[model samples]
Target: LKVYNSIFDQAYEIDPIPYFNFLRKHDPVHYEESIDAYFVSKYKDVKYILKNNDIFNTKTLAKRAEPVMKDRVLAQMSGQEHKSKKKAILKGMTGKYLENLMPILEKRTNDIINKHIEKKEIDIVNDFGKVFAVQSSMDLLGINLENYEKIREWHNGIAKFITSFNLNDEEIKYSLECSDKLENYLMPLIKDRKKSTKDDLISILLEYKNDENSISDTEILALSLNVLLAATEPVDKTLAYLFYNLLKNPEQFESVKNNPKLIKNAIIETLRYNSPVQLIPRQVSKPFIFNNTELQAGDTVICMIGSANRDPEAYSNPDEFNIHRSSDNTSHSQNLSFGTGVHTCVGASFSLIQLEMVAILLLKRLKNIKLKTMEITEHGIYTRGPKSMVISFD
Candidate 1:
């Protein structure tokens, strides 16, 4: 990572092959004992991975991730098959399915908000964000839970597995153990959905038929896992960030408070400023030149989305936090936060709707929101954000 910063900062969007080439050839072998990790900071290198999945090895990525997944369907396929499966996933995430899921989300959001609405002060992350994320995810995936405590425990275990990328041996073992435990729990749920389909996502995945084949139990598992992983943190993290930043910037908050129409723009700005998922990792497939460096097949690369969003070449003044920022220079503001290209996050529409809804609720009902304490506590190295977003306003 240090070696990469030496060669280039965020401004360079050329090929990342040289950087990857240099790292692969000679770099400090920290975490060498673990998964042989590599970093590719430039857009070129990231695109290389995206465009050439054939030569690059993503199976390692999938294999490591597949165990905890709800539906094993999406991870089992490759190329056109994977693409088609992803499309189906997108369908489930959008339009009527998404609209249908919102009432559930709204209901849960209200339930969580109501718990703290009477309090003069509250731990928003623990009191609201945490519960909201869990119940909302459960609602979307149709995971029924009689006890809120059980829901919290299940979510914590799954989140640990998803968040920890730089996990030590004990953590890895615990995560795998948790994955196994979760899979067992979900298997029965899956069977029931298949036997007696309903209107929820699980039922849809259960009954979805393409080319005369329904989603297998394994596919069902993968889909469910993805729902849990993608749904929980990304939206909530953005929500937390927007809340913190908006409260800190009173003028911006006032603008939203006054017009309310600017709520959407403010949310978008916060998302761009501190997107919950900051990097998209992809394996390089086939030989391709990144920037000026010639990269061979089978190299792993990380697109530094956090850096890309601030690329001055792409955005006129990338670091400035302005809701009314012009999109004319959105070249790099179009950074791969949710990702670019085909496999971009299928949950984007769902994410945006959820954000807008939250913004509306916060703007209208929140009387005097103030972040009591703010800290960026790391939950995981991969997908990261504030571990505890403590706040209060009643």
Candidate 2:
């Protein structure tokens, strides 16, 4: 297998294991001269890039969107700024807070399942997963339920705008439009929360005073927008992909359905097998030696988490969808799906709970559910999931 610039383009969203396997074996530290970027596939190399925040910075999004939106996003922030902002944001949705919110999450998950349980057939990706992800995130964020659809619309646009490396004129226009709309909607809420806060994310953020100076309104709005993006797509896609894998492996689905306790492990397996985020790009701050390969300053290194997740050296039978895949060890547990180090997703625990609840409710309500189509297809270049997963049940 010869290494080429368009190798990533050749990797399909539904299944890129073979491509990753080839890369891990032959060219783990692959440099594509055409794109002037390196695609690192091995788990250690991917983890190295993620952990070494000093050498490989997470400013890709910030750099891309600087022209359209100048506000600093927490996802791209590094060092003390990243730590402080992350701490402030975490104050709103800590483990204790999320634990208390379970009853509400359970009801929400049940309602969504109940609505579609009678339909007999539904596109879980669009009808169930997408709605649940956005609505549940809003409930936690203290966003109004009435504005769900509008907020989702804005979030969808903003998600695309944030992930895309090169945006065309129309894309840039749409990105700015969505950003403006979200900021406008958040301005009044921020003002009210500051005046008299409540027991929600807005209030929590308002109360997050740092170094005797509270986080500014601009940064708050940026964080809120980040929350919307972070909470929505990853959860939505993971839900669909989990179901996709389970349906594809009927025995595993039945095993989990019988023993509901295995739902968490099942979700973890899905995350490892088909990560919601396929590629994480980092720009080299300075000359660095990664996996014995010399990387020049200003070069781009794309950590292929999807590929690394399937690396044979890290996990036995990496392609197999096993719920009980020896997750007790650090290597198995530290799947790059939620990421690693400073920029690791704060909502990892939150996302896992939502996914578990959804799975439990789905299994309880939708009995004998099976894929309506012979094959499930996927979409998106960077962040990918089942495009349309129609399932029939009961």
Candidate 3:
């Protein structure tokens, strides 16, 4: 594939499977001097990095994500502090609040579906999936829907800033501006939550105290922004990708449409086949060797989870998108799409639930949904998704 001498290749963005296949077979631990980083593309190596938390520091996330968050990301914290805050975030995302949010999600999902069903056509990525994901996430957070347009742009900026590898001067400038606007909007709402408790994530975070020492407002803001990006960013891509995969494989799509049981399997396969978050960025705090690659302190590491999932050494018939693919951890590597170990996203289930529920509604409501075109191009090497997906239904 002549993948060795390529840089800024459109091929990697359009489709990274072959590029990754080259890395896994020839250079499992490849170095990128331009970024002063090593791209680790083996399943075990990525697993090891994720599990051995301190060995490779998530400290880099502060520089990458904190500009938008304005404080330390929860993923970079540890001990009781990390646990307590994560607990509060989880409480807002799961259990009773989560149960309570279902009615709103269902109501909103149907609202959007109904709006689009009449159109007889929709761009799944923009019209249906993103709309639902953003609106539902905002509802869960108790954010003001009055500012939906501004909120959308703000979070989109924050999401791209965190997930990206490179950005030009203007891009870096605009992303921060968007972050600032979000901060301005949330500050007053955060103060109001302190005055009166509400059935929202902000109130939950405000009520959280560690030994009578409440987390600061800015930290709360930080966590909320982080949660916003994590929760909202993946849903549209995943829903679109699930449909994209099934649409590409019509036989599988028909089977899933007929046999509802196969729906979950299709989502699972999509994670391995077209993962939303393609790269996990890290920094080496402690020096160690990884499969003959010498790691030095402060050496940034990019764990290619997207590549590892498709590695021939890790999975047999790696190129095949089979929904019947076994969940066998015996020989094949489990896909680390939502990440693993300490870095595992606490809202992982939230994302999965969002995907499955949305998939169910679309499959049930729009029985004759079909892609407008078969040629779909995804963007970004860091966080990949179909650029746009136009679909039609009768």
Candidate 4:
């Protein structure tokens, strides 16, 4: 902002991160040099793209998956195709599915909590993040315990390599190889699930359709990728960060510890406070003009979710952490943490339930959950997460 002010109308930019602005996508190659396409760090700009689906769309999905799968799933489709798939996928994300998965999620959450309890010390990121989200993804997919570690390894590898502006030929090449391995693993399971219906996500995927034809295998692969990339990574980051923030604000910790039902609200508020995805990207489908500036077709528009969530215009004390804050509390905090508009995350409510399940189960089983001297590593560019988080409990 100072740089923009210093420019005196001369355009200039700054690379927020020394490496890349993984926080927001559609980054100018030289953001530090360009002013016309410089990053916007305001709430209004972020909400503008998110709320206006017709003008700016994830339907192209081009901005996100274009570098990889290019127009395979809901992200890529627009109009009818996007709408149809969204309807079908929304069925998969509904309360019926979450209700059934609650027990499974509770069990999985307990298993990990017990393991950490027995060990007395555990890397919460490894023991919690990987385990919680992976188990939820597996339960959603009907993955067996035997295949758990292998599937997690592949997903973790993909998470590491995918969020980059520059991937060497070898890194890109290896990612392709790992994706192939995932296909090999999922195909038989998909086929087997097709033979007999099950209460899992795969069977539903095979049966789901907007018209007579169900989702394609390619779409299934995309959804699988979505579950890991979106569902797991973000939840993991949110949970670990919640753990971090609660340690900092033990008052909030005591509030949640006193009444475990507050876990759901706490998790939701924590996400809004520091959204894991930070900002989501959209590709401009048609030219749009604002402030005498015209954005042309095929432009990448980045929303500053990190800054937007804190926009005082939208939220009261936008910077403060108040778990009790609800949608009724402030209209602005209709919280884009999950996202906004047509592309708002299908898994938003479900993810919160999963987090609540973890929090409640941990509260019930453990005498107390506290942080230990540890390290937190942030890896992927797009995801603000701990590559590994270490902690202890008693």
Q: Pick the candidate with the highest TM-score.
A: 3
Query: In candidate 3, residue 334 scores what lDDT?
Result: 70
Tell me the TM-score of each prediction against the true structure.
0.84, 0.92, 0.95, 0.84
Q: What local distance difference test score does each model get?
A: 0.64, 0.79, 0.82, 0.66
* Model 3 C-alpha lDDT per residue in residues 1-394, reported as the tens digit of each score: 4235432566777677777877777777778766667888888788888887788878888888887899877988998888878888889878999998877888888888888898888888888777887888888898867887778888888888877667888999999999999999999999998998898999998888778988899998998888888788778888888888888899998899789888888887898888888888888887799767788899888899888787776778877888877745324667888789876888877766767787888877886888995888787788778878888898
Can you list the residue pairs that collide in candidate 3?
Answer: none
Q: Is candidate 2 or candidate 4 better by lDDT?
A: 2
Q: In model 2, which runs have C-alpha deviations exceeding 4 angstroms?
A: 1-5, 8-15, 33-35, 65-70, 327-333
- Which residue pairs collide, candidate 2? none
**C-alpha root-mean-square deviation, candidate 1:** 5.3
lDDT per residue, candidate 2, 1-394, as tens digits?
3645345464544466667887788788888765678889899989989998888987776666544344677866766877877886776677666766677778877787778777897777988888888888887778877888988888888778766655788987887798788778878888987888777777777788667888788777777767777788888788888888888888988889778888998998899987888888899999888558888888899999888888877887788888877756424546899889888888887778778888887877787787886687777767888877888998
lDDT score, candidate 1? 0.64
- Flag regions of model 4 displaced more than 4 Å: 1-38, 63-71, 326-332, 374-379
lDDT winner between 1 and 3, please give it: 3
Which 10-residue window of candidate 4 scores lowest in summed lDDT? Answer: 6-15
lDDT assessment of candidate 3: 0.82
TM-score pick, better of 2 and 3? 3
